[model samples]
Target: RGSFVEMVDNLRGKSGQGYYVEMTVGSPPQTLNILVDTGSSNFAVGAAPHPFLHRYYQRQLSSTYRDLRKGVYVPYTQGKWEGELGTDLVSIPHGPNVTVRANIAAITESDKFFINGSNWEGILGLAYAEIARPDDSLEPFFDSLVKQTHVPNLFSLQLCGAASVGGSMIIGGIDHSLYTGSLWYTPIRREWYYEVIIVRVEINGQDLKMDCKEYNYDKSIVDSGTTNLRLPKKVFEAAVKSIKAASSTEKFPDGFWLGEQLVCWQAGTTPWNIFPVISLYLMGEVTNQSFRITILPQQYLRPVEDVATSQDDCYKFAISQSSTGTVMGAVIMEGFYVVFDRARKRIGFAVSACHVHDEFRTAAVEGPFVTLDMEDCGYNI
Candidate 1:
């Protein structure tokens, strides 16, 4: 049987930001809290000394720790991590303890690490080995587990809402009870990231035709580390325009900024009823079935209070413009139970049950590869 790891949201006051898990490293086992990132592939721990420091991996404390003496530099949108490549005994809580021989980075230097008041001391990347660093060339943690521990090559994520305390990540099998409907399946076009193509974008019942050249490349990557939705510049503009057009009040301008580019409207005066439901039609390459995920007004519009104006009538749209490929962040993921079926090279989604007390369950499916059946699942566009 596979194991389950509880993922704690360490976003502080900011929800849908980052999810961290507790793990132990070294021979004697030193506990460390780290971020779970599916966008990148590298399991790293922060080194000693501080601007913002947490308990880190100490070579001397672990009898089984090995220093590779190789330097590594990894870059991200916010900042980068520079460190020495090494290996040690890494164990996930309530799971099998495995000796990680390689594919681990001990971060010695962090530039603008973006701790954001989080207690997490490190990050564990769950993407495929394609994107892993050269020096840390070895099977990823999950990969090794499947091979060594006989755990299935599947992981599930149930990211709770802002009001919740914690979420969970099932390491090896699907927890059917976590979702209300049958799982919707989509093929993974690329292994480096959970990349997929958006077949259509619908507002209310009307489809927003992606006729413009800027929207030609419809590829999107599901990244939980990102706080909000990041889309192409033109696509973002069009979506915002549609929302404003649907609004009854013309008192506010097209858009405004509060430290970042965002669309805000008077809290009570805004017409949320007129706001249309946004639906994303995702195409499944292998299953050949179209799966739709709907985003309601309450999910996209966040209410905030402006201290400068002493007004509680401020709202910010969760979507933002980005220069890169479409990044489906946590803002959209809160509605569903997501499964990363690495073995089949596909992803699955289902209506999230959001049951706070539901015990995590696991079941084994037909191996080599499997696609979820949508017949019994509630399928709507």
Candidate 2:
């Protein structure tokens, strides 16, 4: 009979951009759109009135806001910001419904961090304290929320990739209705960045047949802030080559794959039907079984909506090559509901309610399929 922590609420977000929840910060209560990210941990808001942002937190007006005077900077894949860390009272008007004195970074300088016409104003990192900005001595937003209130130590995300109704973020628990079927929980390979093991990757049911280590090259992390499904160079090339061979009847230019150009067709039709469904097989709770989560072209062959007055509908390939570890970004997460369950030391994936639309609902989590010999896979480490 306890659903207080599992409150279901709609968060405001753009399709391809990011998801943010409205947060009221400062004692007098200045509200700002706080971007929800499971990738990193640092709750920072803009302090300077940049043209891109509609407003910034005015420290002078809040009697309860305290200046910690600790300098901090956070560098994302595309954006970075420098600010001073401070302590302030933070509350969510809805959802978990708790308020506490939280660590806040007032961004004073930024480069490509904020874009004009974007909906979000700041970032709220949901990961552990290991990657906390400046140092791990400070408690992150989620950690602060849990320690102060003693709510369930978990959160879930549902990104509306191709759907029109934004998406949702459940802070302390999961809304059973947001996902389909029972969830398959996979162990977190590492606590940092929600690292998990990739047993293999398949396209159109054709296994890439690469070594498991290649799938987890360096490491693999599930990050909501990232826009593309990033893979290591070797794995990325293999995936592209497979897509080329499978869809050889039609050709896409190198510029399209390299993220330099957009491929467009007449507005009435879609290029997604021809693309294959991509599946990521992950290590199960035990070594004997594998859990495979799949996404259709609707997730990777993304549609672009903002094109001025053009009659052509443009699409961008959502997969990119990463210099670092493999990142299962929003493009991948958009297909299924993902659970960050710290209490169980596991992550769960299930079909998301947001992934359903007019005719087809393709996102899925199927399998406890038999896995190969445990020793054959390098993930045990």
**lDDT values for all models:** 0.65, 0.82
- Where in model 1 is the C-alpha error above 4 Å? 1-17, 94-102, 134-138, 163-165, 212-218, 249-251, 257-274, 285-288, 303-315, 355-381
| Residue 307 miss distance in model 2 (angstroms) | 2.4
What shift in Å separates residue 232 of candidate 1 from its native position after superposition?
Answer: 1.6
| Candidate 2 minimal-lDDT segment of 10 residues | 1-10
Native-referenced Cα lDDT, model 1: 0.65
280 Cα displacement, candidate 1 (Å)? 0.8
User: Which candidate number maximizes lDDT?
Assistant: 2
Candidate 2 — which pairs collide? none
Task: Give the clashing residue pairs of candidate 1, or none.
Answer: none
Which TM-score value belongs to model 1?
Answer: 0.81
In model 2, which regions exceed 4 Å deviation? 1-7, 163-165, 356-361, 373-381
